[PDB]
Amino acid sequence: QYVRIKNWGSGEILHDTLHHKATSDFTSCLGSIMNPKSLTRGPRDKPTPLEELLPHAIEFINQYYGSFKEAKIEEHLARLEAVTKEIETTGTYQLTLDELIFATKMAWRNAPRCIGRIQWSNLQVFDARNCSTAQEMFQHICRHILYATNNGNIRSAITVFPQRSDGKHDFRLWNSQLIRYAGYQMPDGTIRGDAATLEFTQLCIDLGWKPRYGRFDVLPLVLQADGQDPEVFEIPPDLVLEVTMEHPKYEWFQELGLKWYALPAVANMLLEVGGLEFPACPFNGWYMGTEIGVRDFCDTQRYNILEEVGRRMGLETHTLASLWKDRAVTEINVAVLHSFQKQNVTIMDHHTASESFMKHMQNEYRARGGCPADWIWLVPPVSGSITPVFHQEMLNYVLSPFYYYQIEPWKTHIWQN
Amino acid sequence: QYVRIKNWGSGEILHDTLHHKATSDFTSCLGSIMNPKSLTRGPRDKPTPLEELLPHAIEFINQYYGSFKEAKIEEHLARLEAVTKEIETTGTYQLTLDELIFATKMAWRNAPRCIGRIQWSNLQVFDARNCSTAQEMFQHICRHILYATNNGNIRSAITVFPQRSDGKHDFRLWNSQLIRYAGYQMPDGTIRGDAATLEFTQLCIDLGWKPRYGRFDVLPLVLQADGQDPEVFEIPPDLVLEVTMEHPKYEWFQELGLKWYALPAVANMLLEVGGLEFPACPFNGWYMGTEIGVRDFCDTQRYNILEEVGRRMGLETHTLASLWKDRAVTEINVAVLHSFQKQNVTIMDHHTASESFMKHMQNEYRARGGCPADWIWLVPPVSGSITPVFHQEMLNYVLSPFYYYQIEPWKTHIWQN
Ligand code: HEM
Ligand code: HEM
Ligand SMILES: NCc1ccc(C(=O)N2CCC3(CC2)N=C(N)c2c(F)cccc2N3)cc1
Ligand SMILES: NCc1ccc(C(=O)N2CCC3(CC2)N=C(N)c2c(F)cccc2N3)cc1
Ligand SMILES: C[C@H](O)[C@H](O)[C@H]1CNc2nc(N)[nH]c(=O)c2N1
Ligand SMILES: C[C@H](O)[C@H](O)[C@H]1CNc2nc(N)[nH]c(=O)c2N1
């Protein structure tokens, strides 16, 4: 009937019933796998079978009208009929603006790996389903970036491009994120910039983009429209807001010459809703300090500044047991938060975020008897057990609507020219 | 054929084949659940069915002889025959000392939640399968504690009590750990000592144990022998080695009056091997600093000293974004490591431990194509992504031999007197 969940920090118990509405993934528990097939929705070469589409469409429409505080029975029935007829006569159907808005928010609510879901009801939706060219995609994206950045007062938004038709005319953003720094393999063998974007940077260069060989060069947008070859578009520098890193006490921190972008936006995910699939739907929220201070700046395969910060603090960087790494990573986190705050750019520390999600989870179980959550992604990369999420048992399941991963476009794309 | 595993810090790929030898657990991924049924092996009221026992026995014997560098075919066949005959004539069978040693080490190797498995081959085995009374259990346990403590130079050991026969004569240690501090609900409503042991402490008191109402009172051993009612035995103070907490710089840290025991030993788990079950098999290794500094001292449901340490450091304890918690927990971790080191008591910091396990995992895949690992338990409660384990994809599966959890004895015990 329900799965029992326990919070070992408060002793509180919760009953999960929502998992029954899961779509089942089948299968050596693969919890720590980053990109499993169960969270990936691949490409197609033919339209969605009507026997599959119609049932999902009905299901979604029922969910939509079932969300209203005061039911609108006639509208419900009418919409059910209109959708069916549209599917029979066209082979698919178009969501109303309100349905799309509901779908985007529900898919956000259903994102197990997002710790900021308490904000789920606050989301700006940009309808670009009429987009037809790469140039138009670029314009829509620039508008998204501008609205979201909002001069430092970050706002959550999502831009919905045309849904997948037959699978050969997909709208896709080849970039993993809207804003990301380039990575270069220098002549002397050293790596410059973000080491994690070496391959994608080389791809942009291969497509005509001009490499600037800097530490923080913003990558261009590689846009695919109507299934045609991807076109490169440089992001107008005036639209990219950045924060220069400074430490409240360590004046030498500035000497590191570090900075980061204010806008965190995923650009390569697919929105699934009522049998439909939107291969291009970039969305954004705001940053959590640890993402930059810990992952971007301290991962060894990224900027890897940990040791350098250690020496500058005068720590015993040659003795692991000294816990110098713990001390350093924290000052870096302090720098990130301090800089964003000083420059009036929205950001949240991991402690506040963790308590925020706990409140949300509590609200979700009360509202719909559950909240899909991936513990591995919800617990911060530092001070894990200091946050309440660490002590909270969670159930991870895939509902609908949902935001899926996709197979890298360059691996499945059929080149024309 | 094999599952692909990737380390995102080195890019290294691994092929897991060992998971095929898993015993299958069936089923809303329940990865973050602490005590799931799949990791629990409950009580019985009748002997193990021969149709089930024999196949497992054969399987184990084959594994044992199959581990030798230079095969001993005749011995193998002979043992297979002897076991079968013993099972038919007695209804069960006895493992040889060497088989038990192999079983205990293999079960350790198969513990997905243990980060210290690189030491798997270094284990002292105490054969107490001839034990018959609670008094004898107490003596065996005191010997274990003495050998393991070794005046600060901690040694890994396990004491194997008589295997389960019919299920009504089980040898069980009611304590979760060999050494643990009491928790008291004081008259003024405040909690004194380890808040997590309130219930078990009350149980000891109900069994005649005399409460000392201290902050660090070592709990007595509650021993069950031959299925009879549990008897209480106080642990001789001379056998309990403790470390007084001091900070290398903060002279005021000592004013906190903190200390902890040097011997980390689980006492309520069950060893499963070749169809047999040993409900009582206490084992120990050595401490990892974070267990004490982070979980014992900083969990809110435990000693909860975080805020107090924060104020004493003069931090902004009323502003989460200041990251005062991160700064404090680290100094506490520094104190723990410093104190254990100064007092010459074996301990490992989480960084060294993490790199140690990574080496082990590498060895395991090379040796047998796999290593069962629970990421959620292997990543430390602080500085998660700073350790390599965080970036390592892992497969969690249950093999055999294996150390299982058990249903709390006081919930299933049938009282005599
Ligand atoms: C209100 C601000 C928001 C905050 C602070 C927030 C924060 C986060 C964080 C910290 C992560 C983990 C990132 C990583 O480790 O790669 C994440 C993941 C995610 N978020 Fe949220 N988020 C917000 C808004 C949104 C919005 C508006 C959507 C979608 C409509 C969303 C969808 C997701 C999804 C699908 C993931 C998983 C991405 C992946 O698998 O790489 N989030 N978010
Ligand atoms: C050589 C020293 C060893 C170290 C440093 C070590 C360390 C650890 C640590 C840190 C944990 C997690 C504890 C927790 O969070 O509750 C653990 C769990 C575990 N260890 Fe090891 N260990 C060692 C030896 C052993 C030995 C000798 C055995 C058994 C023969 C063993 C069996 C296990 C098992 C079964 C678990 C899971 C316990 C549970 O689920 O509560 N370990 N160990
Ligand atoms: N593995 C290397 C890597 C990955 C992602 C980013 C990146 O640009 N990020 C990190 C993930 C990201 C979006 C910004 N961070 C958020 N706060 C975010 C968000 F606010 C909403 C939805 C998804 C998000 N994910 C940088 C580097
Ligand atoms: N949840 C409250 C709690 C749990 C366990 C202990 C405890 O005594 N511990 C923590 C777990 C423990 C054994 C010592 N720590 C180890 N290093 C250990 C070990 F060395 C070998 C096997 C199992 C172990 N587990 C204290 C408090
Ligand atoms: C192997 C492991 O799944 C991987 O390193 C993880 C774990 N936890 C994470 N959690 C978040 N939020 N983001 C991540 O990228 C990861 N990566
Ligand atoms: C809910 C969650 O499983 C629980 O808090 C965990 C997680 N990680 C852990 N990891 C270890 N090593 N030990 C623990 O007790 C826990 N507890």
Set of chain B residues whose Cβ sits within 8 Å of the Cβ of A390 = 381
Quick check: A399 and A23 in contact, CB under 8 A? yes
Active site residue A355: no
Q: Rounded to the nearest 10 degrees, what angle do helices B324-342 and A324-342 cross at? A: 170
Interface contact B298, partner A, CB < 8 A = yes
Cα–Cα–Cα angle for A401, A147, A119, nearest 5°? 45
Residue B240 and residue B163: Cα distance in Å, rounded?
28
Best mutation site among A41, A106, A114 for ligand 1 pocket (most ligand atoms within 8 Å of CB): A114
User: Per the omega criterion (within 30 degrees of 0), is the bond before A49 cis?
Assistant: no
| Of B376, B390, B381, nearest in space to B332 by CA | B381
Interface contact A391, partner B, CB < 8 A = yes
**Minimal Cβ distance to B349: which of A31, A300, A321:** A321
- Name the phi and psi angles at A363, rounded to 5: -65, -40
Yes or no, beta carbons of B349 and A323 under 8 Å apart:
yes
SS3 string, A59-85, reads HHHHHHHCCCCCCCHHHHHHHHHHHHH
User: Within 13 A of B250's CA, how many CA atoms are on the CB side?
Assistant: 24
Residue B74 and residue B72: Cα distance in Å, rounded?
6
One-letter amino acid for residue A323 of the chain: L
Active site residue A410: no
Residue A401 and residue A405: Cα distance in Å, rounded?
13
- Distance from residue B264's CA to the centre of ligand 4 (Å): 5
Interface contact A327, partner B, CB < 8 A = yes
User: Per the omega criterion (within 30 degrees of 0), is the bond before B381 cis?
Assistant: no
Which residues make Cβ contacts (< 8 Å) with residue B98, sequence separation at least 6?
A: none
Cα–Cα–Cα angle for A169, A174, A178, nearest 5°? 125
Interface contact A19, partner B, CB < 8 A = yes
One-letter amino acid for residue B246 of the chain: E
Best mutation site among A113, A292, A376, A382 for ligand 5 pocket (most ligand atoms within 8 Å of CB): A376
What residues form DSSP beta bridges with B223?
A: B173, B231
**Cα–Cα distance list, A166 to A181, A276, B329 (Å):** 34, 11, 55
Active site residue A117: yes
Torsion on CA atoms B71, B77, B83, B84, rounded to nearest 10: 150
Active site residue A114: yes
Please indicate the experimental technique that yielded this structure. Answer: X-ray
Yes or no, beta carbons of B385 and A337 under 8 Å apart:
no
User: What stretch of H or E contains B271?
Assistant: strand B270-273
One-letter amino acid for residue A409 of the chain: P
Q: Which atom of ligand 4 is nearest to the CA of B194?
A: 27
Residue B377 marked ligand-binding: yes
Q: Identify each DSSP E strand in B36-148 by its residue range.
A: 124-127
Catalytic, out of A117, A164, A302, A312: A117
Which residues make Cβ contacts (< 8 Å) with residue B299, sequence separation at least 6?
A: A9, A385, A391, B196
| Of B395, B396, B393, nearest in space to B7 by CA | B393
| Of A180, A181, A138, nearest in space to A159 by CA | A138
- In angstroms, the first-to-last Cα distance of chain B is 56
Which residues make Cβ contacts (< 8 Å) with residue A343, sequence separation at least 6?
A: A152, A243, A244
Yes or no, beta carbons of B301 and A3 under 8 Å apart:
no
Set of chain B residues whose Cβ sits within 8 Å of the Cβ of A349 = 320-321, 323
Ligand nearest to the CA of B290: 2
| Of B350, B391, B389, B287, nearest in space to A323 by CA | B350
Q: Identify each DSSP E strand in A216-291 by its residue range.
A: 221-224, 231-233, 242-244, 259-261, 265-266, 270-273, 276-278, 283-284, 287-288
Cα–Cα–Cα angle for A211, A199, B11, nearest 5°? 140
Ligand nearest to the CA of B31: 6
Which residues make Cβ contacts (< 8 Å) with residue B241, sequence separation at least 6?
A: B149, B151, B152, B261, B262, B263, B345
Residue A227 and residue A171: Cα distance in Å, rounded?
6
SS3 for B218?
strand
Q: Mind telling me how many Å the CA of B5 is from chain A's nearest CA?
A: 8
Q: Identify each DSSP E strand in B60-194 by its residue range.
A: 124-127, 157-160, 172-173, 183-185, 191-193
Torsion on CA atoms B80, B82, B86, B87, rounded to nearest 10: 10
The residue whose CA has the least distance to atom 16 of ligand 6 is B377
Which residues make Cβ contacts (< 8 Å) with residue A85, sequence separation at least 6?
A: none
User: What stretch of H or E contains B403?
Assistant: strand B402-404
Residue A242 marked ligand-binding: no
What residues form DSSP beta bridges with B159?
A: B126
Q: Which domains does chain B have, with CATH numbers?
A: 11-129+156-166+270-284+354-378 (3.90.340.10), 130-155+170-241+405-409 (3.90.440.10), 242-264+287-352 (3.90.1230.10)
Yes or no, beta carbons of A380 and B384 under 8 Å apart:
yes
Burial of A128 (0-12, 13-18, 19+ CB in 10 A): buried
Place of tokens 């270094």: B122
